[PDB]
Amino acid sequence: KETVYISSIALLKMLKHGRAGVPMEVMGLMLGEFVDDYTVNVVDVFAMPQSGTGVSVEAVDDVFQAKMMDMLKQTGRDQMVVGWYHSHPGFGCWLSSVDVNTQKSFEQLNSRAVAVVVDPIQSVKGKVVIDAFRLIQALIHGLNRHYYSLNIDYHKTAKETKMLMNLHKEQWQSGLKMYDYEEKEESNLAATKSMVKIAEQYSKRIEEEKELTEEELKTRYVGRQDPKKHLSETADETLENNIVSVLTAGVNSVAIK
Amino acid sequence: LQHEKVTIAPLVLLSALDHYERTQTKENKRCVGVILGDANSSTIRVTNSFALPFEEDEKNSDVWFLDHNYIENMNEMCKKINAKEKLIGWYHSGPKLRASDLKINELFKKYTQNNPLLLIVDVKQQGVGLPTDAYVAIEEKTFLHLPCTIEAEEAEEIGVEHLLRDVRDQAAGGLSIRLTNQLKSLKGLQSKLKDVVEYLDKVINKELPINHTILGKLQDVFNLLPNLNNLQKALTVKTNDELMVIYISNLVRSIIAFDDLIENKIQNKKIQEQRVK
Amino acid sequence: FDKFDSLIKVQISKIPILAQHESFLRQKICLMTLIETVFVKNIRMLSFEDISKATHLPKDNVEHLVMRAISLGLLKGSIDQVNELVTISWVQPRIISGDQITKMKDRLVEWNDQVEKLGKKMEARGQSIWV
Amino acid sequence: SLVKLFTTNELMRWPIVQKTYEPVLNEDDLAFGGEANKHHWEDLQKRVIEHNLRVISEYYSRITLLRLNELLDLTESQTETYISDLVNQGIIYAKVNRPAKIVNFEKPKNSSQLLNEWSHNVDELLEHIETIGHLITKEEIMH
Amino acid sequence: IHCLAVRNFKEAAKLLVDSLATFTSIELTSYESIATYASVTGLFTLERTDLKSKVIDSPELLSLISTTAALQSISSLTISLYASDYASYFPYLLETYANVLIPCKYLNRHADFFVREMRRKVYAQLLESYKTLSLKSMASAFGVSVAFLDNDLGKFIPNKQLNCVIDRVNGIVETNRPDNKNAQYHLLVKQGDGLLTKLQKYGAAVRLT
Amino acid sequence: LDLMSGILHCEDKDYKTAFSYFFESFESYHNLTTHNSYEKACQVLKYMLLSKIMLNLIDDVKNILNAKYTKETYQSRGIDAMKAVAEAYNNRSLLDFNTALKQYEKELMGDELTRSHFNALYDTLLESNLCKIIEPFECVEISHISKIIGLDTQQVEGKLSQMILDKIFYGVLDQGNGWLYVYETPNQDATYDSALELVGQLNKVVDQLFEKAS
Ligand SMILES: [Zn+2]
């Protein structure tokens, strides 16, 4: 039920610094605000210099930190330090015990402070691997034992999005574009489960409608819609969406190869 | 020295935006910060930016103030992070130029080397795209306009993608409309392939000088051709999986239609019945 | 491969710095050869034999040659021993001289033609559906 | 050369390692002592095994338990023991089709995930040919 | 208990099994009787994880156990199921057939319909983890001879109540059940055609009428 | 009133709350009449150790074996057993755990609760070791799992049956060839399943449609 909302600039600065430090792990701090018990919002990030030793407690640099703080004050960015990013390149997202102790050093600052692990290399143009969570593949380290996972979402202002739109100009390329497949897996599934759901509704309307007059039936059902029209209706989206879905791939395979 | 095309990463955009609404600066005023990237070669690759506190002199500013100590205090505090991002130039998000612009660029010539680049982010977006516009100053000394682009580095590829997952369009146009849009696209591609072919002819024949920057991109086009966990059966299993849904859906239409036949036949039976008397 | 192999025979006696490091030169050749034989090939896959004959390398090393070709960044891809294939996800962009372009012109003519036939072949079918 | 030797991804070949670094190693007092610290030389062998077996997991998609033994200079009980180890720590993803046959190192990808790969490949392709368009116009003007 | 008085257990499952929370005996019958009922219906229609949930875990039946001459027998059956004790299953099965079922004025009518079912489940449950297993393994387990075991499975298999199929030449048993997408393909093809031919059939009739 | 609550918390499986009671309740019978209550302070030391043995913590078990506290008087059948069973657990050598189910049972057979939690714990140990031996493998001839885990096949596949059937690791046993297959995910597809339901509901709806024949 608990969650964090990670603004775009945070996420991009994140992945940038991470990808830039490869193949060594980088750390930094997270600026935001705690809405309620159920939420942490992260609007900002700044990057913490390298250390001779690995990412660790003293890697956090007071001088550097406050030195950044005030200079953000002058920009009005004033926020708490709500968590700290990090990266475990190639190793997936989990906290080593050494990650843990530091996480505690951020518990005693604020009890709700969170840990964010980013994984630059295997995060790729598909799904981005990211994780945020706090203490008490990954189960080897006691995913649930010493600590526990959290959830993540992304705040987007209208204008933000509007900038992001113009990145790709798809106006020429449309029609060879194949939309995300997993999404049409939930599509082609939930659609079918639904058709099942209204099947026996159409069954009940044919039996009841059989033994009861139309004038009586209307009184009952006018509230909802004619389950025969959810068959007639719902069959379509599956039909044509799946025919363009098939054809599009049939073309990309033979044409593009 | 002389540079032509200007490249920009999306993070200066989002950054500068968050500077605008972070600082609540209304349109009659503007926002200002500086720009870090690579100015060396004959393009200019912008990557990172950070916000600069400044003041304009009441209305109709005769003077102004930028904090140079804030600059030379922040800069090296970036250099400790990624040393390879060098201070380049500044930006004001004000939709159109100001009088002191040409004056202060001359100041930034203190903290950079070649030709401090001034680009203008459009924070209102209310117009069409390319909220940026890129400018330099050449002699006299006015601002030469330059082209721009938004060049996603791999990290920004990943980010912008993962953030724009959901906004993707429904495109309710009927089946014929879609299937049309496609074949249009195919012909388009065909044409462009013409273009490249006879061009390459002009490279080995017309002796248009070798343009490496293109050849690189051709190569990158080959690197992306799917070899074709083999992807092949990865695709076959899908196409089977869709053809299922197509099929049982067809069953659903068929049974429906049959129903409507029942409604006709029953209907004509009772009508023709009544036509008796 | 062979032409280079001829060239080294003379100068290899001449310049003593070349006298040393002949091993390098040999490896480096085998590599470049490999890279090209992949770069031209329409569908990128190889048996180990193919690389052997192309590089005139006995096939045990062939997987050392491939693995080393990757660890320098030149290739990405995987090796399947059971069937003795090499998939080669992708091959590094590299500045191209004149002749090497021509083949690119070719393959691109092909992949122009395939589209010629497909696009021109899909109006006929489904002529009754257009808008 | 030692550190650079474990940074890079390549096969170690234990004997040559022992030969080369034998003297300089053995000379040191704490790490590789006369009879007291000899127990380090068994570790070093272990780390070597884990190294080669760690990289093969990178390149090879499949390999035959025989050839893998040959590459590691080990036996089958040994091999399967090391694979068992590394996979228990989740260092590598390898799954042994056991009856005297085949280690399989590919992380099996959900076919829809393979697709979402191949789409993006296609899209970035088209974007490139587009740029090649705008350029390919531009040069004639320029020239 | 009416629902139980007919073949319909599927209702008696929830009905009885929640009647354990509160029960009025002076109405009809003793609390241990209705215990035997809710436990029998429970055994009969409950899924393996909901058997453990709602019955094997009994704030009530635990409070009874030896209380009667049945619940110890029938529970001694159910535990022998849930816990995969195959050697013991049939003996307790016979027991309960004699001790609880046939004396119950409600159940006795249904006695056979129960036991037939309770055979299948075990056969089912025994195979579910095997894509092939050999008869003598099964017969050994249950402690019957092969020929009789084969003879028993032959009742269920052709009715597609059991997803096995037998190979007598080798004395082997392989399990074809709809899990791997393959099976869920074939079965779908067959069911689909079975719907078509019907649909067409009636189709021509209403066409010509 | 204490150790009985420790007992009920050995029924609810919280062993920290349990030892909370067992420690004190040991101390009482410790300092008390000792006439026959040397044995009633000999009883609780056990459950005190059951707590830890369940809790995997062998350090506090070392703490429990100290001469004066108990051993000085109480060196006896109790301690050797529950020790050997304890570090036998933390070593996870099942042959050891078994032999300590052999030669120490002179009490274990008598004390019901103890022996119970050792049968439980023994299970949840053998389970684990299995889950660790299989995952590097597919098509692993089951004799191999046996000799590795060091146990007779018949009860191995006796358990692997139970695990398959409990949804633990998603695989299937082929007894024809003596093989065990493992899978990564449920092999079955959900989509096709919902198709298989839809065809049914339809196949009824058709019949009911044609009933309208009239
Ligand atoms: Zn870490």
Distance A152 CA to ligand 1 centre (A): 19
What is the Cα A119 distance to its own chain's centre? 15
Distance A48 CA to ligand 1 centre (A): 14
Residue of C99, D101, B26, E14 lying closest to F139 (CA atoms) = D101
Pairing status of strand A114-118 against strand A130-135: antiparallel
Q: Identify whether the C-beta of residue F184 lies closer than 8 Å to the C-beta of residue F137.
A: no
Distance A94 CA to ligand 1 centre (A): 7
Residue of F112, F119, F107 lying closest to F42 (CA atoms) = F107
Rounded CA separation A178/A180 (Å): 7
| Beta-carbon separation of F195 and E185 below 8 A | no
One domain for residues A125 and A196: no
Q: Identify whether the C-beta of residue C80 lies closer than 8 Å to the C-beta of residue D62.
A: yes
Rounded CA separation C126/B182 (Å): 13
Token pair for B171: 């495109």
Establish how many alpha carbons lie within 13 A of residue B66's alpha carbon, considering only the half-sphere containing its beta carbon. 22
Rounded CA separation D106/D109 (Å): 8
Q: Can you give the three-state secondary structure of chain E, one letter per residue?
A: CHHHHCCCHHHHHHHHHHHCCCCCCCCCCCHHHHHHHHHHHHHHHCCHHHHHHHHHCCCCHHHHHHHCCCHHHHHHHHHHHHCCCHHHHHHHHHHHHHHHHCCCCCCHHHHHHHHHHHHHHHHHHHHCCEEEEEHHHHHHHHCCCHHHHHHHHHHHHHHCCCCEEEECCCCEEEECCCCEHHHHHHHHHHHHHHHHHHHHHHHHHHHHC
- Main-chain phi, psi angles of E107, to 5 degrees: -80, -30
One domain for residues A137 and A234: no
Token pair for E120: 């299948």
Rounded CA separation F181/F189 (Å): 18
Token pair for B2: 């002389």
- Whether residue F199 lies within 8 A of chain A, CB to CB, comes out as no
Residue of F106, F87, F107 lying closest to F97 (CA atoms) = F87
Residue of B258, A199, B269 lying closest to E202 (CA atoms) = B258
Q: A78 lies in a domain?
A: yes
**Scanning every residue of chain B, which has its alpha carbon at the shortest distance from the alpha carbon of C45?**
B227
User: Where do we find the tokens 């029960």?
Assistant: E23
| Beta-carbon separation of A251 and B182 below 8 A | yes
One domain for residues A250 and A123: no
Token pair for F20: 């909370």
| Beta-carbon separation of A189 and F211 below 8 A | no
User: Where do we find the tokens 């006369």?
Assistant: D34
Which of E199, E206, E207 lies closest to B255 in CB terms? E199
Q: Identify whether the C-beta of residue A135 lies closer than 8 Å to the C-beta of residue A147.
A: yes
Token pair for F94: 């099942």
- Main-chain phi, psi angles of A47, to 5 degrees: -100, 140
Token pair for A224: 């909802």
3-state secondary structure of F104: coil
CA distance A145 to chain B (A): 30
| Beta-carbon separation of D112 and A140 below 8 A | no
What is the identity of the amino acid at E139? A
Name chain A's partners: 3 or more CB pairs within 8 A: B, C, D, F
Name chain C's partners: 3 or more CB pairs within 8 A: A, B, D
State whether the Cα torsion F176-F180-F183-F189 is positive or negative. Answer: positive
State whether the Cα torsion F171-F173-F177-F179 is positive or negative. Answer: positive
Which of B244, B251, B261 lies closest to E206 in CB terms? B261
Q: Identify whether the C-beta of residue A36 lies closer than 8 Å to the C-beta of residue A72.
A: no
The structure's method of determination equals cryo-EM
- Cross-strand bridge partners of residue A3: A39
3-state secondary structure of F105: helix
Distance B83 CA to ligand 1 centre (A): 23
One domain for residues A133 and A203: no
Token pair for B219: 């190569």
- Main-chain phi, psi angles of B166, to 5 degrees: -80, -30
- Whether residue C17 lies within 8 A of chain B, CB to CB, comes out as no
A–C: how many Cβ contacts below 8 A? 7
Residue of B163, B156, B154 lying closest to B11 (CA atoms) = B156
State whether the Cα torsion E155-E159-E165-E169 is positive or negative. Answer: positive
Residue of A76, A86, A75, A8 lying closest to A41 (CA atoms) = A8
Q: Identify whether the C-beta of residue A247 lies closer than 8 Å to the C-beta of residue B181.
A: no
User: For domain B1-168, which architecture applies?
Assistant: 3-Layer(aba) Sandwich (3.40)
- Cross-strand bridge partners of residue B137: B143
Rounded to the nearest 10 degrees, what angle do helices B231-276 and D111-142 cross at?
A: 100
3-state secondary structure of B274: helix
Q: A68 lies in a domain?
A: yes
Q: A231 lies in a domain?
A: yes
Pairing status of strand D102-104 against strand E164-167: unpaired
- Cross-strand bridge partners of residue E175: E164
- Main-chain phi, psi angles of B142, to 5 degrees: -110, -175
Which of F192, F202, F206 lies closest to B244 in CB terms? F192
Which region holds residue F83: left if phi is over 0, alpha if psi is between -120 and 50, else beta?
alpha
What residues have CB less than 8 Å from B105, skipping those under 6 apart?
B89, B90, B116, B118, B137
Rounded CA separation A6/A83 (Å): 12
Q: Can you give the three-state secondary structure of C44-68, one letter per residue?
A: CCEEHHHHHHHHCCCCCCHHHHHHH
Token pair for E140: 């050994």
- Whether residue E194 lies within 8 A of chain B, CB to CB, comes out as no
| Beta-carbon separation of A178 and D119 below 8 A | yes
B–F: how many Cβ contacts below 8 A? 25
| Beta-carbon separation of F200 and E199 below 8 A | no
What is the identity of the amino acid at C81? Q
What residues have CB less than 8 Å from F93, skipping those under 6 apart?
F150
User: How many angstroms is the resolution?
Assistant: 3.5
Peptide bond connecting B226 to the previous residue in cis, omega within 30 degrees of 0: no
The domain containing residue A238 runs over which residues? 180-257
Q: Identify whether the C-beta of residue A170 lies closer than 8 Å to the C-beta of residue D128.
A: no
Q: For chain A, what is the domain count? A: 2
Which of E185, E199, E209 lies closest to B254 in CB terms? E199
Kindly write down the DSSP assignment for every residue of C89-126, as one continuous string.
Answer: -EE------HHHHHHHHHHHHHHHHHHHHHHHHHTTTT
User: Which helix (H) or strand (E) is C76 found in, with range?
Assistant: strand C75-76
Rounded CA separation E71/E35 (Å): 8
Radius of gyration of chain D (CA): 23
What is the number of other CB atoms lying within 10 angstroms of the CB of residue A173?
Answer: 19
**Scanning every residue of chain C, which has its alpha carbon at the shortest distance from the alpha carbon of B212?**
C95
Which of A163, A180, A181 lies closest to B13 in CB terms? A163
- Please, which contacts does A240-244 make with residues 24 or more away whose CB atoms are closer than 8 Å? A240/B174, A240/B175, A240/B178, A241/A184, A241/A187, A242/A188, A242/B242, A242/B245, A242/B246, A242/B249, A243/B175, A243/B246, A244/B175, A244/B178, A244/B179, A244/B182
Pairing status of strand B86-92 against strand C75-76: unpaired
- Give the single-character DSSP code of A209: H
What is the number of other CB atoms lying within 10 angstroms of the CB of residue C3?
Answer: 6
Distance D124 CA to ligand 1 centre (A): 33
- Give the single-character DSSP code of A140: G
| Beta-carbon separation of D59 and C78 below 8 A | yes
- Cross-strand bridge partners of residue B37: B46, B86
Q: A207 lies in a domain?
A: yes
Rounded to the nearest 10 degrees, what angle do helices B212-223 and C98-122 cross at?
A: 50
Domain boundaries, chain B: 1-168, 169-277
Residues 121 through 140 of chain D touching chain B, CB cutoff 8 Å: 121-122, 124-126, 128-133, 135-136, 139-140
Which region holds residue C106: left if phi is over 0, alpha if psi is between -120 and 50, else beta?
alpha
One domain for residues A51 and A12: yes
What is the identity of the amino acid at E76? S
Q: Identify whether the C-beta of residue B244 lies closer than 8 Å to the C-beta of residue F192.
A: yes
Name chain B's partners: 3 or more CB pairs within 8 A: A, C, D, E, F
3-state secondary structure of A137: coil
- Main-chain phi, psi angles of D36, to 5 degrees: -80, -45
User: Where do we find the tokens 């004001």?
Assistant: B92
> What is the end-to-end Cα distance of chain C in Å, rounded?
56
Distance B4 CA to ligand 1 centre (A): 43
Rounded CA separation F150/F144 (Å): 9
- Main-chain phi, psi angles of F12, to 5 degrees: -90, 0
User: Where do we find the tokens 């999986």?
Assistant: B241
